[PDB]
Design an enzyme around this catalytic site. Structure first.
Site, PDB file in Angstrom:
ATOM      1  N   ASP A  60      -7.496   4.540   2.230  1.00  0.00           N
ATOM      2  CA  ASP A  60      -6.701   4.131   3.423  1.00  0.00           C
ATOM      3  C   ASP A  60      -5.903   2.900   3.130  1.00  0.00           C
ATOM      4  O   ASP A  60      -6.217   1.999   2.232  1.00  0.00           O
ATOM      5  CB  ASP A  60      -7.774   3.688   4.553  1.00  0.00           C
ATOM      6  CG  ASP A  60      -7.079   3.248   5.858  1.00  0.00           C
ATOM      7  OD1 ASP A  60      -6.365   4.082   6.432  1.00  0.00           O
ATOM      8  OD2 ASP A  60      -7.516   2.158   6.179  1.00  0.00           O
ATOM      9  N   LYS A  73      -6.276  -5.538  -9.079  1.00  0.00           N
ATOM     10  CA  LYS A  73      -4.745  -5.230  -9.216  1.00  0.00           C
ATOM     11  C   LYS A  73      -4.383  -3.823  -9.197  1.00  0.00           C
ATOM     12  O   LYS A  73      -4.111  -3.239 -10.289  1.00  0.00           O
ATOM     13  CB  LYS A  73      -4.345  -5.984 -10.540  1.00  0.00           C
ATOM     14  CG  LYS A  73      -3.466  -7.201 -10.330  1.00  0.00           C
ATOM     15  CD  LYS A  73      -2.996  -8.071 -11.484  1.00  0.00           C
ATOM     16  CE  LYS A  73      -4.390  -8.536 -11.681  1.00  0.00           C
ATOM     17  NZ  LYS A  73      -4.813  -8.584 -13.123  1.00  0.00           N
ATOM     18  N   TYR A 192     -12.669   8.915  10.447  1.00  0.00           N
ATOM     19  CA  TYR A 192     -12.050   9.616  11.497  1.00  0.00           C
ATOM     20  C   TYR A 192     -13.004  10.071  12.565  1.00  0.00           C
ATOM     21  O   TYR A 192     -13.371   9.717  13.581  1.00  0.00           O
ATOM     22  CB  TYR A 192     -10.963  10.093  11.401  1.00  0.00           C
ATOM     23  CG  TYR A 192      -9.627   9.306  10.533  1.00  0.00           C
ATOM     24  CD1 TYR A 192      -9.069   8.375  11.404  1.00  0.00           C
ATOM     25  CD2 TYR A 192      -9.234   9.717   9.338  1.00  0.00           C
ATOM     26  CE1 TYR A 192      -7.982   7.781  10.647  1.00  0.00           C
ATOM     27  CE2 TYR A 192      -8.177   9.068   8.837  1.00  0.00           C
ATOM     28  CZ  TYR A 192      -7.513   8.009   9.504  1.00  0.00           C
ATOM     29  OH  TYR A 192      -6.436   7.447   8.886  1.00  0.00           O
ATOM     30  N   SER A 259      -2.774  -0.466 -12.416  1.00  0.00           N
ATOM     31  CA  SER A 259      -1.661  -1.128 -12.678  1.00  0.00           C
ATOM     32  C   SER A 259      -1.026  -1.154 -13.947  1.00  0.00           C
ATOM     33  O   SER A 259      -0.009  -0.628 -14.386  1.00  0.00           O
ATOM     34  CB  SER A 259      -1.706  -2.596 -12.299  1.00  0.00           C
ATOM     35  OG  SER A 259      -1.297  -2.825 -10.701  1.00  0.00           O
ATOM     36  N   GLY A 466      30.238 -11.041 -15.455  1.00  0.00           N
ATOM     37  CA  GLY A 466      29.662 -10.407 -16.674  1.00  0.00           C
ATOM     38  C   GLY A 466      29.214  -9.176 -16.980  1.00  0.00           C
ATOM     39  O   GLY A 466      28.890  -8.498 -17.883  1.00  0.00           O
TER      40      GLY A 466
HETATM   41 FE   LIG Z   1      -6.374   5.873   7.768  1.00  0.00          FE
END
Ligand SMILES: [Fe+3]
Ligand SMILES: [Fe+3]
Length: 689
Positions: A60, A73, A192, A259, A466
């Protein structure tokens, strides 16, 4: 191979059962095999992943944030798509559903019974607490948000909370025994559909879920009619009105991977195949986005249309967005800790040398200005987006990239000018600077028409003088998009280090960080690229008029420069002519727009006010300039700002990046960027989704 397969993390038996059912139909299709790893809590998977025990899990938004924080990370690689095939969305809404007939509104939840999806989740926790902060009466100096919340609602079911420290908040939960309040589907009222059921069963008066939760649990409208939503203006409305009656809009859930060494492409190869074979409205034996009766949101949110591949440069903070990121941040920080953050201006320093000048400026300023640092400008831009930094001065080419990301010019660096000596620097109109091609007189036979095959020095890739101008013009005359194929070798800080565009770069005093786009690299910037020429490392350098004059005839005093004579150099004109370096007005490649300070539009107003004042103290004619510290002087190293800068001028109104740069230059870059893809640029298109 130990990387030729994806290990998915599951937090429940049915999820595990679904996973194996998935892994089974996968091999038949011949794709990166799916291994299923068992776990008991969301955390366990986050940790499991970073510890190379697993490679993927759908989170989530609020958990995605938590997963990106330093200990772990992790980063979002794919986003779930909601809505419908004709009208898809990559965001959703946080709504508060209540039984029709009650009377309370948003501003009357005090003492009620609450049902939450889980602690730290977007719709089930983050959004609400944000909205309900005013009525909570909470003091971070006394207890955490949980304590305040425990004193607000009489009882609720916020899965994951500590039933020992905050029992009040696990009362309405239906978990059996040790499962009570469990941070997993082992708890009935979890998720939910769980929080909704917590309401359906009449255990609590409110249920904080998303817009589709109702329509997913109650198909017959007749049933739906018995439920309503709580609007922000303290009124109720039918559940299909969520587009108007919602607490906030949040970003969709995302699959996260490591990562570094995360198997990104592998994870995506699998998902893209999986959705194309078992997606929505697709084959009905096994549904990727569906769970068996009584089970819900296994692995992926139910009835999701599919996935969206997230660009490499967007991390958790970027993925969440400024709006959501600010909200979450305000939850973890103090009320004054945030006020402090807003009252000050955070400058972004690019490199160790600029960082040091900034820390100095910060001290002299009195800590009004503070510093943040990145190894590259692109990274500083991302820091401003994430809200980690407020501003910095960018070359024209960078103002295009910052512009393509929603940053805006604020003040422009105004160099002392001959013309308009009539007005005062702050209101004086900006007059660009001339970009030129310089070469050594001795270099006989070298003209514009003979640059092919030679060696070149560039301030850095993507900058005006440049790069954009020279390569722009070279591409138009060459037709090809291969610039690294024009010059035999060059130094263009920022290009592929293993490339020949970096084959002439120095690195630091130890030959380290070769080609890095910051002052640590010897041949970086206006002065660095000039020195590259002076030292005969390259045959031609692309800089601005000012650089030639500032580092010749003993104006630099630096070893390599002190003994340089401007009569040793010539400029290459576009008419195939060479000319003395005093003929710039007639022999330049283009007049570029001044460098300018950018920032987030919502911060711009503030940054400017702080700047106009700072510069009144350490600017050209500032109170403590010569004596205590000077803002626009960095010993010819052009740190933070150009040294030939007199002040920062008002841009007259609020021009957009396009307006500021000029149509002419904007399309020029645009057409040149059509040859190459910039990670930050990709990441940014996605920022508007
Ligand atoms: Fe959610
Ligand atoms: Fe420039």
């Amino acid at each position: 191979a130990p990387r030729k397969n994806v290990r998915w993390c599951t937090i429940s038996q049915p999820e595990w059962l679904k996973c194996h059912r998935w892994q089974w139909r996968m091999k038949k299709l011949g794709a990166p095999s799916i291994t299923c790893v068992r776990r008991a809590s969301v955390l366990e998977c986050i940790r499991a992943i970073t510890e190379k025990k697993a490679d993927a899990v759908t989170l989530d938004g609020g958990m995605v944030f938590e997963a990106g924080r330093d200990p772990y990370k992790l980063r979002p690689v794919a986003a779930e798509i909601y809505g419908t095939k004709e009208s898809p969305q990559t965001h959703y809404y946080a709504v508060a559903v209540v039984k029709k007939g009650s009377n309370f509104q948003l501003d009357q939840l005090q003492g009620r019974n609450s049902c939450h999806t889980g602690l730290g989740r977007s719709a089930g926790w983050n959004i609400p607490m944000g909205i309900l902060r005013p009525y909570l009466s909470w003091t971070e100096s006394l207890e955490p948000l949980q304590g305040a919340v425990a004193k607000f609602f009489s009882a609720s079911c916020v899965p994951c909370v500590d039933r020992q420290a905050y029992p009040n908040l696990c009362q309405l939960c239906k978990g059996e025994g040790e499962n009570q309040c469990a941070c997993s589907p082992r708890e009935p009222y979890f998720g939910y559909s769980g929080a909704f059921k917590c309401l359906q069963d009449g255990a609590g008066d409110v249920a904080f879920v998303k817009e589709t939760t109702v329509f997913e649990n109650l198909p017959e409208k007749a049933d739906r009619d018995q439920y309503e939503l709580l609007c922000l203006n303290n009124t109720r409305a039918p559940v299909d009105a969520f587009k108007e009656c919602h607490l906030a809009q949040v970003p969709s859930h995302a699959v996260v991977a490591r990562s570094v060494d995360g198997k990104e492409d592998l994870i995506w190869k699998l998902l893209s195949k999986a959705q194309e074979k078992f997606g929505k409205n697709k084959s009905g034996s096994f549904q990727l986005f569906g769970s068996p009766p009584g089970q819900r949101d296994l692995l992926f949110k139910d009835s999701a249309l599919g996935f969206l591949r997230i660009p490499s440069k967007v991390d958790s903070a970027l993925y969440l967005g400024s709006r959501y990121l600010t909200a979450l941040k305000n939850l973890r920080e103090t009320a004054e800790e945030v006020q402090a953050r807003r009252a000050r201006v955070v400058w972004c320093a690019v490199g160790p040398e600029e960082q040091k000048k900034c820390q100095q400026w910060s001290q002299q300023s009195g800590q009004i200005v503070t510093c943040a640092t990145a190894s590259t400008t692109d990274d500083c831009i991302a820091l401003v987006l994430k809200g980690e930094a407020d501003a910095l001065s960018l070359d024209g080419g960078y103002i295009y990239t910052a512009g393509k990301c929603g940053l805006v010019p604020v003040l422009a660096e105004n160099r002392k000018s001959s013309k308009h000596s009539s007005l005062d620097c702050v209101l004086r109109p900006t007059e660009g600077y001339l970009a030129v091609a310089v070469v050594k007189k001795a270099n006989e036979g070298l003209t514009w028409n003979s640059l092919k095959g030679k060696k070149s020095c560039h301030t850095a890739v993507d900058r005006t003088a440049g790069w954009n101008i020279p390569m722009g013009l070279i591409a138009n005359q060459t037709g090809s998009c291969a610039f690294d194929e024009f010059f035999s070798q060059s130094c263009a800080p920022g290009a592929d280090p293993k490339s020949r565009l970096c084959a002439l770069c120095a690195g630091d005093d130890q030959g380290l960080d070769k080609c890095v786009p910051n002052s640590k690299e010897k041949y970086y910037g206006y002065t660095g690229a000039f020195r590259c020429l002076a030292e005969d490392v390259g045959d031609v350098a692309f800089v601005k008029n000012d650089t030639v004059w500032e580092n010749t005839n003993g104006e630099s005093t630096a070893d390599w420069a002190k003994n340089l004579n401007r009569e040793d150099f010539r400029l290459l004109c576009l008419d195939g002519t060479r000319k003395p370096v005093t003929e710039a007005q007639s022999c330049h490649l283009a007049v570029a727009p001044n460098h300018a300070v950018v920032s987030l539009s919502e911060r711009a107003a503030h940054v400017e006010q702080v700047l106009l004042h700072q510069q009144a103290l350490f600017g050209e004619n500032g109170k403590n300039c010569p004596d205590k510290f000077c803002l626009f002087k960095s010993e010819t190293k052009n740190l933070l700002f150009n040294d030939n800068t007199e002040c920062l001028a008002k841009l007259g109104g609020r021009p957009t990046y396009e307006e500021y740069l000029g149509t002419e230059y904007v399309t020029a870059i645009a057409n040149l960027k059509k040859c190459s893809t910039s990670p930050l640029l990709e990441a940014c298109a996605f920022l508007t989704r």
